[PDB]
UniProtKB/Swiss-Prot annotation:
Zn(2+) 15 binds at H200, C204, H207, C222. This is Guanine-N7 methyltransferase nsp14. Inhibited by Remdesivir antiviral drug (GS-5734). Mg(2+) 1 binds at D67, E134. It is found in: Host cytoplasm; Host endoplasmic reticulum. Plays a role in viral RNA synthesis through two distinct activities. The N7-guanine methyltransferase activity plays a role in the formation of the cap structure GpppA-RNA. The proofreading exoribonuclease reduces the sensitivity of the virus to RNA mutagens during replication. This activity acts on both ssRNA and dsRNA in a 3'-5' direction. Residues 355-369 are annotated as: GpppA-binding. It comes from Severe acute respiratory syndrome coronavirus 2. The chain holds residues 5949 to 6449 of 7096 of the full protein.
């Protein structure tokens, strides 16, 4: 039950306008053969160019929408479009490049995939809405064979050079001319009615059709993400560490404790309404307050409506005390809220482009997140950076410039000189805070929140 059997049937109806007369009865084995590749009855870690939905989902970071359009098949020029927004024209002799032979076009394809993918994935998965020219163009830029390692490192080989006769990963591929052992999935096999645009546009108003190859490539990946991450959701699937995942997650826990601890001290709310993850734990276990939890899974599609979360009749009175929405995305937060909200527009290795302005945030698990909307925050203000500690001034166990900051809220700074302990802790917390913000989290708070109110929590 692991890999896609090459003896699985492939539905050819999508193929029959580029490839008239194609047999209705078709396996992966016969299709790969028709595409001009030979798998040589090879048991060497590459059983099929094509993969299961499940396998594609585990390799979402590798997804590159790919589409080819007839420009006038060997007679005529082809437009190659990638979900990176690139269009290359290959002659057989939004970025839009003039007509060039395959021997140069293939170099550009390797450079482009290597730069997109080297910090994302060990592979490429070409996401297709297959009509035929895309599959019959692969022979011109793809080589297959046994699984190999990079010539300069231990990573699996993703590229081949005809010049040097060697194999490279995405990091070591400069001057390489062939994509090696790519994977691919035809979204049209999943059983849809009507064309790509009609199916995409059911779910997404953000990706237009300019009637160019890259636009279909983008719509194809978008539809695929919608199907595997919006309508369907699987939070069991783990994803490898590729960047600052652990630091960001640690940072998110340190900021959450800091901000909620401070709001309770500053405004002394008698009740806190903790709305979101049903696994959620008290972030300030020592606080006096009545802590009431409300279960909401991460909304992958549309932001929750505050009307459905709160009304239908709890403490019932959510207007009493404060509401904590820690990555619980709602259309409009009430005035008495503390909020962490992921900004889908952030550029990072963890954040993949998503469906209808939303983004696919992949950090241990994959969370499709609805488009960031500034109007959600009209009743709140941005939470300013600050560090608060009531811990004793007391070193123990670090090289130093003395800290001066208006935003180091400690007994020692009240006293006019920040102690070494609170200086070290301030600097660690500011680093954590910067990490979290740079990762794309944004923090919002009730308008009355004032750090001036924390100074009297020591006297
Ligand atoms: C830095 O973490 C703490 C330090 C002191 C007390 C509590 C916590 N937390 C943070 C929030 N966390 C929720 C989650 N995950 C519960 C435990
Ligand atoms: Zn390498
Ligand atoms: Zn879309
Ligand atoms: Zn101190």
């Amino acid at each position: 039950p692991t890999h896609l059997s090459v003896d699985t049937k492939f539905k050819t109806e999508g193929l029959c306008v580029d490839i008239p007369g194609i047999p209705k009865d078709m396996t992966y084995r016969r299709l790969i053969s028709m595409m001009g590749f030979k798998m040589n009855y090879q048991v060497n870690g590459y059983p099929n160019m094509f993969i299961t939905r499940e396998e594609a989902i585990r390799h979402v970071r590798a997804w590159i929408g790919f589409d080819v359009e007839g420009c006038h098949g060997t007679n005529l020029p082809l437009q190659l479009g990638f979900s990176t927004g690139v269009n290359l024209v290959a002659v057989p002799t939004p970025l839009m490049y003039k007509g060039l032979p395959w021997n140069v076009v293939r170099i550009k394809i390797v450079q482009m995939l290597s730069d997109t993918l080297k910090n994302l994935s060990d592979r490429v998965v070409f996401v297709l809405w297959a009509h035929g020219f895309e599959l019959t163009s692969m022979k011109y830029f793809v080589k297959i064979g046994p699984e190999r390692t990079c010539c300069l490192c231990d990573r699996r080989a993703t590229c081949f050079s005809t010049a040097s006769d060697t194999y490279a990963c995405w990091h070591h591929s400069i001057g390489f001319d062939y994509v090696y052992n790519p994977f691919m999935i035809d979204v049209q096999q999943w059983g849809f009615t009507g064309n790509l645009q009609s199916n995409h546009d059911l779910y997404c108003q953000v990706h237009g059709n300019a009637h160019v190859a890259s636009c279909d490539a983008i719509m194809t990946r978008c539809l695929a993400v919608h199907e595997c991450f919006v309508k369907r959701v699987d939070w069991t699937i783990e994803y490898p560490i590729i960047g600052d995942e652990l630091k960001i997650n640690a940072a998110c826990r340190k900021v959450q404790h800091m901000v909620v601890k401070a709001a309770l001290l500053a405004d002394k709310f008698p009740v806190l309404h903790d709305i979101g993850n049903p696994k959620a734990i008290k972030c300030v276990p020592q606080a006096d307050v009545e802590w009431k939890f409300y279960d909401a899974q991460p909304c992958s599609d549309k932001a929750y409506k505050i009307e459905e979360l709160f009304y239908s009749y709890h403490s019932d009175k959510f207007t009493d005390g404060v509401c904590l929405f820690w990555n619980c995305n709602v259309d409009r937060y009430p005035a008495n809220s503390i909020v962490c909200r992921f900004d889908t527009r952030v550029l990072s290795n963890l954040n993949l482009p998503g469906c209808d302005g939303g983004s696919l945030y992949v950090n241990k698990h994959a969370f499709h997140t609805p488009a960031f909307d500034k109007s959600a925050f009209v009743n709140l203000k941005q939470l300013p950076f600050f560090y608060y500690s009531d811990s004793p001034c007391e070193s123990h166990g670090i090289d130093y410039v003395p800290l001066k900051s208006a935003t180091c809220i400690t007994r020692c700074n009240l006293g006019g000189a920040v102690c070494r302990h609170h200086a070290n802790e301030y600097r660690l917390y500011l680093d954590a805070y910067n990490m979290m913000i740079s990762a794309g989290f944004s923090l919002w708070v009730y308008k009355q929140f004032d750090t001036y109110n924390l100074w009297n929590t020591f006297t």
